[PDB]
Structures are given as structure tokens and as C-alpha cells.
């Protein structure tokens, strides 16, 4: 009876039935084949270990994340994520639940067609709907207007929604966050005499991406206080027993999110893509887009954002106008608690694609 909200993150695929509390399953999504010769020869070893078992087995596998910039690595591994998750974690019956899968606002077709069709033919769900991750963060946020930031590894997006219609001519996709923040952190960690070249070793970087990084007060002045080294240099210990003491790079990695000259793309930072999306909205409406600027995801969890982001936008946005940035706790699960609110609401249970509709149209007419 009750529908299932399953969010296709790249992290951190998230799964839990429709409301009223925290996701039942969150897991690191990786598939890894064993790349070594296991000369003990039990045998009995899985051909593909999925997450979480592939995050215990670091260094004996070659990790492959299921989606790469919002596009599948192949649907053989994607389907295997889903099957593993549904059967040996949740223990759900496929014929019992209408499902909900998520996608990105400007994601290339036919990835939603092919998906919807494969999940209907493989798992034989009786109904399905696909919501964009930004729209679900509006319902979680509980406001009626505003620009939504779904920033996860490896694609961020900037969608403006107004009372409660969508503006088609102001949607911005930046490929800046978050896998490029992982790669940039890996590129500036070599400077301190250690290296993490393998797929498994990139995970060790991911753990330092969570815990140790910080964001500048203002770049130019944080660079000033950088010449003093005591507060700047903090020493982390890593699971191989080694202690790495990182300085400038501690604030350098998140600072990438402003002015991505470090990545080398010609597009501007979140600061300016925000302003240029607001001034692509209609002249009358812009007044109430200010103070409904809402961040979301897990890659917005660095400490000095959003109050860096706020102070910078407020300087470029019109005077007198109040720019209030909205960044509550829980944002990593925002999308998911959003999805829960949606699939629990009548009447919009009846805006799902039902089996009769799918049987007629097949992979045609999604929208």
C-alpha cells in the first residue's frame, strides 16, 4: 500500500517508505569487482560487492560509482544497486509498493525513459513517478517561493520556483560540485607529501572532505591570517596510522566554490550564477526571490557556507533589499524528507504513472 521514496543520489542513495521519519537505508552506492588474486581459494566470493560491503573491502576491489555526472555507468550495475538494496536491506516486496525515483532538472534524455521502462519491466512495480531533487527540497523547506540549490556529488543545480510555478528561462546547471571538490582536494593533498592514487584511496579523501575542511572568512583576508600557522594547521590521523597536517589547503578546497579558476572552467562561482539567475527572472517577481534563497544537499555542509555566500550575494544584490539565506540542519536528507511529504499527500498520489498507462505508452510520453 504505502509508496517508497528512493532518492538517486551519487553518495548516498537514500531509501525509506513514504513518511513520517528518517530514511530506512542510506549506503555509499559503490560496486567493486575483486581486482586481486585471492589465493586462499574458499571460494564463495561475490562477483560484485555492493555498498556497504564494498566500503569494508577497500583496497581489494576497484570501486565504480553508479552514475557519473548524472548519467549511468551502465544499467547492469545500476539495476544491481537497486536489487541489492530492495532485497537484502529493506526486504520489500516489489508488487506491494508504488515507487518514486529521482533525477536532475536538466539531465539528458533518454535516461528517465529507459529508467522508468527498465524498473517497470524488471521489478514489476504497480506505479512509478520521478521527481526532480530540487522540487522535493521545496516541500521539505516549506516555503512557497525561492531558488533551490541541490548540490550533491557530482552535479549541482540552481532552480527558481515562484508561488508555486516554475520559471523555465532561469534554470542553471553547474558541474562544479561535488566530485570536482573531491578531485581538487586530492590534487592539493599531494603537496603535503602523501598520495591516494587508487579508487579505494579516493574514499580516504572523501572522509577528509567531510570532517577536516573549513571555508574562509573572506579569501584575501584568510590568506593574510594564513601566514600565522598555528590555527591554520590542524593535524588529522588516517586509518593507515599516518598523521597529515594540512594548512592553506584546509580552506583552499571549499574556496573553489567561489571563482572556479582552480578547476579552469570559464563559468563563474555560485555567487555570480545566483545573481545572473535572479536577474533572468521577471522584473516584478525578483523582490520576493530575495529572502527565499535555499541551500540543500550534503555538499553544502562545509562550515563557512552559507554565511560567506550570504555576505557575498548581499553585496552584489540591490541595496535595502533583504537577502536572507536559508540553510537549516538536515540538508543531506532534505530531498528525501521532501519526497516523503509528496508521496504521502493526496490527491497527488494520483499523478503517478500507473501500470495501465505504462502498458499503453511503454517508454513514450513521460512528461
Amino acid at each position: 500500500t504505502t509508496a517508497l521514496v528512493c532518492d538517486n543520489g551519487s553518495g548516498l542513495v537514500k531509501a525509506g517508505f513514504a513518511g513520517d521519519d528518517a530514511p530506512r537505508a542510506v549506503f555509499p552506492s559503490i560496486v567493486g569487482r575483486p581486482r586481486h588474486q585471492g589465493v586462499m581459494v574458499g571460494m564463495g566470493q561475490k562477483d560484485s560487492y555492493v555498498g556497504d560491503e564494498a566500503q569494508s573491502k577497500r583496497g581489494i576491489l576497484t570501486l565504480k560509482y553508479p552514475i557519473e555526472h548524472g548519467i549511468i555507468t551502465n544499467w547492469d550495475d545500476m539495476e544491481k544497486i537497486w536489487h541489492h538494496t530492495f532485497y537484502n536491506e529493506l526486504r520489500v516486496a516489489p508488487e506491494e509498493h508504488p515507487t518514486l525515483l529521482t533525477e536532475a532538472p536538466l539531465n539528458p534524455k533518454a535516461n528517465r525513459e529507459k529508467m522508468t521502462q527498465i524498473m517497470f519491466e524488471t521489478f514489476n512495480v504497480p506505479a512509478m513517478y520521478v521527481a526532480i531533487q530540487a522540487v522535493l527540497s521545496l516541500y521539505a523547506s516549506g516555503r512557497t517561493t525561492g531558488i533551490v540549490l541541490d548540490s550533491g556529488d557530482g552535479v549541482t543545480h540552481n532552480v527558481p520556483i515562484y508561488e508555486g510555478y516554475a520559471l523555465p528561462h532561469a534554470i542553471m546547471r553547474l558541474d562544479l560540485a561535488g566530485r570536482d571538490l573531491t578531485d581538487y582536494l586530492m590534487k592539493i593533498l599531494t603537496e603535503r607529501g602523501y598520495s591516494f592514487v587508487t579508487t579505494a584511496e579516493r574514499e580516504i579523501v572523501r572522509d577528509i572532505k567531510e570532517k577536516l575542511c573549513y571555508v574562509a572568512l573572506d579569501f584575501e583576508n584568510e590568506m593574510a591570517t594564513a601566514a600565522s600557522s598555528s590555527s591554520l594547521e590542524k593535524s588529522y590521523e588516517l586509518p593507515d596510522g599516518q598523521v597529515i597536517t594540512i594548512g592553506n589547503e584546509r580552506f583552499r578546497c571549499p574556496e573553489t566554490l567561489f571563482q572556479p579558476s582552480f578547476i579552469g572552467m570559464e563559468s563563474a562561482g555560485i555567487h555570480e550564477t545566483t545573481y545572473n539567475s535572479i536577474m533572468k527572472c521577471d522584473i516584478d517577481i525578483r523582490k520576493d526571490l530575495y529572502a527565499n534563497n535555499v541551500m540543500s544537499g550534503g555538499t553544502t555542509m562545509y562550515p563557512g557556507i552559507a554565511d560567506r555566500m550570504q555576505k557575498e550575494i548581499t553585496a552584489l544584490a540591490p541595496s535595502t533589499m533583504k537577502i536572507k539565506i536559508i540553510a537549516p540542519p538536515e540538508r543531506k536528507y532534505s530531498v528525501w524528507i521532501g519526497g516523503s511529504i509528496l508521496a504521502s499527500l493526496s490527491t497527488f498520489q494520483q499523478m503517478w504513472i500507473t501500470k495501465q498507462e505504462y502498458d499503453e505508452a511503454g517508454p513514450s510520453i513521460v512528461h
Binding site: 521519519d21 537505508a25 542510506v26 521545496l138 512557497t144 554565511d307 536528507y333 511529504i341 499527500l345
Partner: protein, 586 residues
């Protein structure tokens, strides 16, 4: 039969021989408009059964004495009459297989919890708060942090006047009098005296079991509900949080944590946040806090105040149920006391719950008073042919119907982001197919309905008449959502008396992965539908007898019969149609 001239005791002798004939329990249902003697004539029935048939109870007197005590807790002032009950008590006097009287049990159904938060303009709140700020001494009122009614948020709407006699009025000190009391003094009634009824409450408290020190811990709970209501909330967060408190509400939060016994810091980060965890969703995690909105902090404070009054009223009736407990059982005589069709000139949510209960009682009366009785005229020698009743089952399956009824659109509005009373009113006529039981105010030819715009209320035609309901604060009244951080604080209060207001089946064991976090929203409209259909299964499964009490005038004056006031209580209670099926061929 034929040896009893009409009297109340001719009804009580009849509903005791059906316990000996067909051997089925009988429920006395007293109907009639409010303030009509349905509680006073009931005390005469309980004296008749324990003389004429039953070999007595433990003691008679406690049941009589403690009834006005629970009417301090449940009575208020309404537009129709001054002393009206805002609760539907259901007495269950038990007997056994032989028919020995083993003891009683008093409960309550339809408690007007909304009244605690909002008191209208000429209504009161509950009658226990006006007996505590009027009757409590000056070495008692400073200790419980009490003052005149204008200081409390839950008493700055409605009427703040005390019901007090001329001699009583001057014997209440001036500091306990509000600006409305300075403006227009006490409310005048010959039988309602708030300071007199505080003495007949506290004397009756020591008659049901309470120690005089234990009444003071009951006064700390009532004053803690008053000093909880006084917390005034505001906005928060540089990068957006959700809610904080006001500066003047720091002295009020300290006196609330002094009366309840729960800490101020642990309540300040619980009225302002939605606590949740990530431990359940993984193999390891943490417990974060997500700030609530400003309206959800005020609505949570109101749900926390209504939750304490719910369990204090159930703890008080359990103390009374303990003063005449039952033994082995099988037969039983129930006595219902609830108000019939109490509608006014401004009707809201609680008058729609009264009229919804009346549509179920009238559908009960068509299958217990008309169907069975005329089946007995059609079998007891005469053989009389059927006359059909005028059905109203379609009005019930408009109010409470699953997915397409009114409460299924009201409860769907509260779960929606940004709930609206105009969006819910327009969704009622959008989901409705526009059939004769319901229409918009513009479709009524009455002048009183002319001033109501089509998105500010709706008219339901009921069997006893057409009642317009305004939708101002309708969605707000249905919310009662109790947050999980507040359940592990008010139930698990540091003070033992407060903690012992909760017990089984309300309190129960839990363990990790049970498998979900419920009941979240809860829903007031489905709280009353769950307990109303549960009491409906006890009325359809038991026998019954019907007494209806009509007022001779609405001023409660002796030797005065008014042909307009008596007629409206006969026309708003089901009389003409039921006395048209009964006529038939004989």
C-alpha cells in the same frame, strides 16, 4: 404496563426487567438540549436502581458529589445557556451474572480541548481556572504564581468575569479582578458561584480520596498549563534556524519550569526544534535537531497544554473510578449525558463535531427506536405493515467518508506545506459534487448568511436544520501534533506526581527498529471519529432506553411556559418524522 403513570422512575423499572427477561445489558441515553436536567434526573435514576432492584453500591453519595466536581473540569459558558457541559460523560454501572451491583466506572468522550487555547468572545474557558484564580488564598496564589485572567494568553480572549453573588463579590480581593471585572463586575446567576463551587469542589476532593497536599499538586498542574501558555515565541537564525522565545518570556518560562518540574534549557530547545536521528537509517549515526517554525512552536505549546489537560482529566476520573471499583461482571447499565445539536449564530469546528455526533445518534434512533419497535408491532399479534423512515446515511458519508469526506480534506490540508482555511474551503466544494446536503453561503436566501463570502464558510443541511460553519481557524484547530522530544520530557517529568499522571495503556515499552516513527500529526478529527465509532460499537451491541428533557424557558424560571422557546427544542431534536413512522395503520 398500564399501572405506571408517566414518570422517570417508570422508565428505570422497565430497563431493569429486560436484564432479567432477555438478559442483555441496557444503556440509558438521555437526549435533549443543554442545561435541561439530563444530569440531575440521572442522579434520581441511580438512586432508584439501588433501592427497587439492586442491593446497593459501596456508597451512593460519592457519585453524586463528584459529578459537579468533574463539571468544574468540563463545563463552560455558551450562548444558549450559562451552565453547559463541554464533555460527553458515559457512566458504566456494572452488575454480574446473578445481577448483584459490583461497582461503577465514569469516562468521557468529546472533550473540547480547543477551548483551552481559544475562548471566543462571550464564552469562558473551563470552569476550573476561574475557581482557582477566584477562590485561592493570598498565601496560595503567590506560591502558584497566579494573577488576574488578563495576564494569561489562554484567558485574554473570551469572558474573564467570575460567576459570583453580591455578598461573594466583595469577599474576593481586588487584586484578583481583571479590567473587564473593573469595567462590568461579576456574572450573575443564583446557582453558579465560583468561590462557593471552589469549596464544594475541594470538599468533594477529600470525599473521593485526595489529601489536602495532593490537591495542591493538582493545582500546580492547572497553574503550569496557565504559565505554559504565556510563552510568546519569535523568529531566529543568521542563515535561518526556525524559532526563539521573547525577552519577557524568560520570567514566565522559569515559573513554568518551577510548576511542571521539567528543566528550562531542555524545554527551550524542544519547543523550538524537531529532533531526529540518523542512527536508525545506518549502522552508526548521530541525533540532530532541526528548528520548527514560529507558528509550529505556538501550535506545539498548545498541543502540549492540551496533552496535559487530557491526562489530568483521565487521572482524576481514575481516582474517582478507584472510589467504587467493580468486581466480577456480565450485566451493566450505562448512562449517557451529551448535548443535542448545540448550534449558535457563529459556528465552528466543535459545533460540527456535535452535529456530526447528532447525525449518527439520529441514524441510531432510526434503527433502534423505529425499526425494532415497528417489527414488534408487526409480530406481537397485530401484524402491522411497514412505514419507511427518512434516511440520512448520505450526510454521514459526506462528513466522515474515507478519502471523499470532509475530515479527509481537512486532515490533508494540515500535512500540506503552507495550510490554508480558504484553500480547504474551496477544496470542499471542489471535491463535493454539489448535492443537497452541502452548499456555499451565497446559495442560501437568509440574511445572516449574506455577509459570509463563499471562501469563508460552508452550509451543511442536517436532519434537524441547515447550519452554516465559518472556516476561520478551522485548519489550525485540527492540529494537535505532539513532537517526540516533548514526549520524553512531559511524560518523563522529574516530579513524581506529574510522571504518575501517565500509565498503561498510554505508556508502553519501545525498542530500536519497531519499525517507524508514528503517530506524528495524530489528527483531532480522526481522534474523535476513532472514539465515536468505538462508542458506536458499544451502543449497537447493547440495549437502550430513551429519555428526552425539554426546557420550559431558556432562563430556567419556574411557572413560565413559552410557546416559541419550547417549540424550537422539539423542532431541533427529531420529533415530527419519528411521529409519522409510528402512526401507521393503527
Amino acid at each position: 404496563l398500564g399501572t405506571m403513570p408517566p414518570h422517570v422512575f417508570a422508565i428505570a423499572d422497565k430497563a431493569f426487567r429486560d436484564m432479567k427477561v432477555l438478559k442483555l445489558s441496557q444503556s440509558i441515553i438521555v437526549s435533549g438540549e443543554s442545561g435541561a436536567g439530563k444530569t440531575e434526573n440521572t442522579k434520581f435514576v441511580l438512586r432508584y436502581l439501588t433501592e427497587s432492584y439492586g442491593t446497593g453500591q459501596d456508597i451512593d453519595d460519592r457519585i453524586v458529589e463528584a459529578n459537579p466536581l468533574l463539571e468544574a473540569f468540563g463545563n463552560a459558558k455558551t450562548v444558549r445557556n450559562n451552565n453547559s457541559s463541554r464533555f460527553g460523560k458515559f457512566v458504566e454501572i456494572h452488575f454480574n451474572e446473578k445481577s448483584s451491583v459490583v461497582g461503577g466506572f465514569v469516562s468521557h468522550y468529546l472533550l473540547e480541548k480547543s477551548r483551552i487555547c481559544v475562548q471566543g468572545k462571550e464564552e469562558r474557558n473551563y470552569h476550573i481556572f476561574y475557581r482557582l484564580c477566584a477562590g485561592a488564598s493570598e498565601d496560595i496564589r503567590e506560591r502558584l504564581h497566579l494573577s488576574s485572567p488578563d495576564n494569561f494568553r489562554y484567558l485574554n480572549r473570551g469572558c474573564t468575569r467570575y460567576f459570583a453573588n453580591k455578598e461573594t463579590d466583595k469577599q474576593i480581593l481586588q487584586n484578583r479582578k481583571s479590567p473587564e471585572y473593573l469595567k462590568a463586575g461579576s456574572l450573575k446567576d443564583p446557582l453558579l458561584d465560583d468561590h462557593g463551587d471552589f469549596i464544594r469542589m475541594c470538599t468533594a476532593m477529600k470525599k473521593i480520596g485526595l489529601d489536602d497536599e495532593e490537591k495542591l499538586d493538582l493545582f500546580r498542574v492547572v497553574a503550569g498549563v496557565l504559565h505554559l501558555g504565556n510563552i510568546d515565541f519569535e523568529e531566529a537564525g543568521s542563515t535561518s534556524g526556525g524559532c526563539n522565545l521573547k525577552n519577557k518570556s524568560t520570567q514566565a518560562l522559569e515559573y513554568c519550569a518551577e510548576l511542571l518540574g521539567l528543566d528550562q534549557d531542555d524545554l527551550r530547545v524542544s519547543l523550538t526544534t524537531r529532533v531526529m536521528l540518523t542512527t536508525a537509517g545506518g549502522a552508526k549515526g548521530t541525533v540532530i535537531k532541526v528548528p520548527l517554525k514560529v507558528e509550529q512552536a505556538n501550535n506545539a505549546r498548545d498541543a502540549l497544554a492540551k496533552t496535559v489537560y487530557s491526562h489530568l482529566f483521565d487521572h482524576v476520573v481514575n481516582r474517582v473510578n478507584q472510589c467504587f471499583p467493580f468486581e466480577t461482571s456480565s450485566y451493566f447499565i450505562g448512562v449517557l449525558d451529551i448535548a443535542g445539536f448545540e448550534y449558535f449564530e457563529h459556528n465552528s469546528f466543535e459545533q460540527f463535531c456535535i452535529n456530526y455526533c447528532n447525525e449518527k445518534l439520529q441514524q441510531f434512533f432510526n434503527e433502534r427506536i423505529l425499526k425494532e419497535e415497528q417489527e414488534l408491532y408487526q409480530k406481537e399479534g397485530l401484524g402491522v405493515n411497514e412505514v419507511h423512515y427518512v434516511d440520512n446515511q448520505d450526510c454521514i458519508d459526506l462528513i466522515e467518508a474515507r478519502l471523499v469526506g470532509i475530515l479527509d480534506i481537512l486532515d490533508e490540508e494540515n500535512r500540506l506545506p503552507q495550510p490554508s482555511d480558504q484553500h480547504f474551503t474551496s477544496a470542499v466544494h471542489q471535491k463535493h459534487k454539489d448535492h443537497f446536503r452541502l452548499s456555499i453561503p451565497r446559495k442560501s436566501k437568509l440574511a445572516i448568511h449574506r455577509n459570509i463570502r463563499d471562501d469563508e464558510g460552508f452550509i451543511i443541511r442536517h436532519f434537524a436544520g441547515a447550519v452554516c460553519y465559518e472556516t476561520t481557524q478551522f485548519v489550525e484547530k485540527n492540529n494537535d501534533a505532539l513532537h517526540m522530544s516533548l514526549e520524553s520530557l512531559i511524560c518523563e517529568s522529574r516530579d513524581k506526581f506529574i510522571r504518575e499522571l501517565f500509565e498503561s495503556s498510554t505508556n508502553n515499552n519501545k525498542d530500536t527498529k519497531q519499525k517507524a516513527g508514528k503517530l506524528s500529526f495524530i489528527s483531532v478529527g480522526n481522534k474523535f471519529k476513532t472514539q465515536l465509532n468505538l462508542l458506536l460499537d458499544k451502543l449497537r451491541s447493547t440495549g437502550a432506553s430513551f429519555i428526552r428533557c425539554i426546557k420550559p424557558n431558556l432562563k430556567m424560571t419556574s411557572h413560565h411556559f413559552e410557546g416559541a422557546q419550547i417549540l424550537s427544542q422539539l423542532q431541533c431534536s427529531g420529533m415530527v418524522s419519528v411521529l409519522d413512522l409510528m402512526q401507521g395503520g393503527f
